[PDB]
């Protein structure tokens, strides 16, 4: 395991918070996972699973065995022509898995290009971008049950996926995800509902656009506009878009005719949290070593030397302010430890 004691977790989280782990272990398969568990329980410690630390807010030194998930394996399980079942291990890095699938002429992941982190973590938060979510192509996964050590498979329904949500995010510390299966496609329609994607693809004038083309466009948009954690510490969009009631949407829109919201099948409005934050006047905010990025209003940043507590308390302040200004509660995306 390359077990390690009293160890900075700085390089293991994208916010670049510097706290220490009682023990840090790397895992490369079920054997190692099972061993880390045993040990964790040997030493009387809780176990904290991490992938690439791209959706993690650490707020304190971690009295626990931290297990960096780093197993490997990407393969075609089964080819059924218009769809192909594929499987990847939890430690596989996400965007390179996407690239893998596209190099095999499989579509369905392109809209999730360049999302950081790991395959293992993807179902926990039901990763989504540009009109697509992991559940849309999800087939099943295999998870270790932390209450008794057994393996279980979850099919799509069992995972109780929702917007930036799953059974696994709902029952924290219960399931350890080992590998993931997705059903990808050939020959289906591209997902181009997001204007900037559609327009940037048009401008390249491909005769017959494919998934690979869509992926290059999305990677380019994301590199252009998104703070890279390796320069400016962050965990991406800090806040989920809030969904409001119809009569509450009605009321907010009376207050604000410029309000940005997207109607749902059930009558509710998905508000744009960037718009809210911006309009509450936080864009580019800065106060000691924390702030909100000047352009991307969802991206909370560590300008350098922030504590996790500082990011937390800034998030809290913004939430509080937006509750008070718009009557809306913004939920966090990152997992808080
Ligand atoms: C610059 C940037 C852009 C981003 N853009 C997007 C985006 O477009 N869409 C989107 O959805 N997200 C986005 N994110 C968030 C993030 O990349 C995803 O949430 C990602 O799935 C987290 O993966 P990770 O491996 O980094 O998870 P970590 O941050 O390592 O872990 C997240 C949570 O999952 C748990 N976990 C991790 N692995 C396992 C496992 N194997 N079994 C059980 N639990 C586990 C951890 O304990 C933790 O609670 C972005 C983040 C950044 C920094
Ligand atoms: N969570 C993260 O860390 C992270 C980081 C980077 C990008 N992203 C995602 O990647 C995509 C691009 O991000 P962005 O920050 O540039 O925002 P964007 O495309 O400028 O869109 C801004 C806001 O409008 C919404 N939106 C735009 N077009 C839409 C449509 N056709 N239908 C429904 N909603 C629409 C987005 O919702 P949605 O967010 O619901 O799409 C978001 O609230 C988004 O889908 C976003 O979720 C996420």
GROMACS .gro file of N, CA, C and O and ligand atoms in nm, residues 129-130 164 193-194 222 225-226 236-237 241 262 270 272 333, ligand 2:
model
  108
  129UNK      N    1  -2.253   1.758  -1.765
  129UNK     CA    2  -2.212   1.880  -1.834
  129UNK      C    3  -2.284   1.875  -1.969
  129UNK      O    4  -2.305   1.768  -2.028
  130UNK      N    5  -2.337   1.990  -2.008
  130UNK     CA    6  -2.376   2.019  -2.144
  130UNK      C    7  -2.492   1.938  -2.187
  130UNK      O    8  -2.500   1.904  -2.304
  164UNK      N    9  -2.683   1.605  -0.949
  164UNK     CA   10  -2.564   1.601  -0.869
  164UNK      C   11  -2.583   1.516  -0.741
  164UNK      O   12  -2.540   1.554  -0.634
  193UNK      N   13  -2.784   2.061  -2.742
  193UNK     CA   14  -2.871   2.161  -2.688
  193UNK      C   15  -2.801   2.286  -2.635
  193UNK      O   16  -2.865   2.388  -2.629
  194UNK      N   17  -2.675   2.280  -2.592
  194UNK     CA   18  -2.611   2.399  -2.538
  194UNK      C   19  -2.552   2.480  -2.652
  194UNK      O   20  -2.465   2.433  -2.726
  222UNK      N   21  -1.401   2.457  -2.231
  222UNK     CA   22  -1.366   2.436  -2.091
  222UNK      C   23  -1.222   2.490  -2.060
  222UNK      O   24  -1.202   2.556  -1.957
  225UNK      N   25  -1.232   2.879  -2.056
  225UNK     CA   26  -1.300   2.954  -1.951
  225UNK      C   27  -1.283   2.908  -1.806
  225UNK      O   28  -1.312   2.983  -1.715
  226UNK      N   29  -1.231   2.789  -1.783
  226UNK     CA   30  -1.236   2.734  -1.650
  226UNK      C   31  -1.104   2.735  -1.582
  226UNK      O   32  -1.011   2.665  -1.628
  236UNK      N   33  -1.433   2.362  -0.889
  236UNK     CA   34  -1.521   2.372  -0.996
  236UNK      C   35  -1.636   2.459  -0.950
  236UNK      O   36  -1.618   2.546  -0.866
  237UNK      N   37  -1.754   2.431  -1.006
  237UNK     CA   38  -1.877   2.498  -0.969
  237UNK      C   39  -1.911   2.461  -0.828
  237UNK      O   40  -1.929   2.344  -0.802
  241UNK      N   41  -2.724   2.439  -0.919
  241UNK     CA   42  -2.842   2.516  -0.953
  241UNK      C   43  -2.964   2.481  -0.868
  241UNK      O   44  -3.001   2.371  -0.865
  262UNK      N   45  -3.459   2.760  -1.618
  262UNK     CA   46  -3.488   2.664  -1.724
  262UNK      C   47  -3.601   2.575  -1.677
  262UNK      O   48  -3.582   2.504  -1.581
  270UNK      N   49  -3.550   2.541  -1.285
  270UNK     CA   50  -3.407   2.530  -1.249
  270UNK      C   51  -3.346   2.665  -1.268
  270UNK      O   52  -3.321   2.703  -1.380
  272UNK      N   53  -3.038   2.948  -1.257
  272UNK     CA   54  -2.894   2.949  -1.282
  272UNK      C   55  -2.828   3.012  -1.163
  272UNK      O   56  -2.849   3.130  -1.137
  333UNK      N   57  -2.176   2.170  -0.409
  333UNK     CA   58  -2.140   2.054  -0.481
  333UNK      C   59  -2.031   1.972  -0.411
  333UNK      O   60  -2.045   1.854  -0.396
  339LIG     N1   61  -2.021   2.118  -1.161
  339LIG     C1   62  -1.901   2.159  -1.209
  339LIG     O1   63  -1.799   2.157  -1.144
  339LIG     C2   64  -1.883   2.211  -1.348
  339LIG     C3   65  -1.766   2.273  -1.392
  339LIG     C4   66  -1.763   2.317  -1.525
  339LIG     C5   67  -1.873   2.300  -1.608
  339LIG     N2   68  -1.984   2.241  -1.557
  339LIG     C6   69  -2.100   2.208  -1.638
  339LIG     O2   70  -2.062   2.214  -1.772
  339LIG     C7   71  -2.158   2.286  -1.846
  339LIG     C8   72  -2.100   2.426  -1.877
  339LIG     O3   73  -2.075   2.501  -1.756
  339LIG     P1   74  -2.083   2.666  -1.750
  339LIG     O4   75  -2.037   2.686  -1.609
  339LIG     O5   76  -2.034   2.730  -1.872
  339LIG     O6   77  -2.231   2.718  -1.766
  339LIG     P2   78  -2.301   2.764  -1.900
  339LIG     O7   79  -2.301   2.670  -2.015
  339LIG     O8   80  -2.260   2.908  -1.917
  339LIG     O9   81  -2.451   2.765  -1.853
  339LIG     C9   82  -2.477   2.855  -1.744
  339LIG    C10   83  -2.601   2.814  -1.670
  339LIG    O10   84  -2.704   2.795  -1.762
  339LIG    C11   85  -2.742   2.655  -1.769
  339LIG     N3   86  -2.770   2.626  -1.911
  339LIG    C12   87  -2.709   2.673  -2.023
  339LIG     N4   88  -2.768   2.621  -2.136
  339LIG    C13   89  -2.864   2.539  -2.095
  339LIG    C14   90  -2.962   2.460  -2.163
  339LIG     N5   91  -2.960   2.461  -2.300
  339LIG     N6   92  -3.044   2.387  -2.085
  339LIG    C15   93  -3.040   2.394  -1.951
  339LIG     N7   94  -2.953   2.471  -1.882
  339LIG    C16   95  -2.866   2.540  -1.949
  339LIG    C17   96  -2.637   2.571  -1.693
  339LIG    O11   97  -2.699   2.456  -1.625
  339LIG     P3   98  -2.629   2.317  -1.594
  339LIG    O12   99  -2.513   2.350  -1.503
  339LIG    O13  100  -2.746   2.246  -1.523
  339LIG    O14  101  -2.579   2.259  -1.730
  339LIG    C18  102  -2.583   2.678  -1.598
  339LIG    O15  103  -2.666   2.697  -1.485
  339LIG    C19  104  -2.279   2.297  -1.761
  339LIG    O16  105  -2.367   2.198  -1.803
  339LIG    C20  106  -2.224   2.285  -1.619
  339LIG    O17  107  -2.305   2.211  -1.528
  339LIG    C21  108  -1.988   2.198  -1.434
   0.00000   0.00000   0.00000
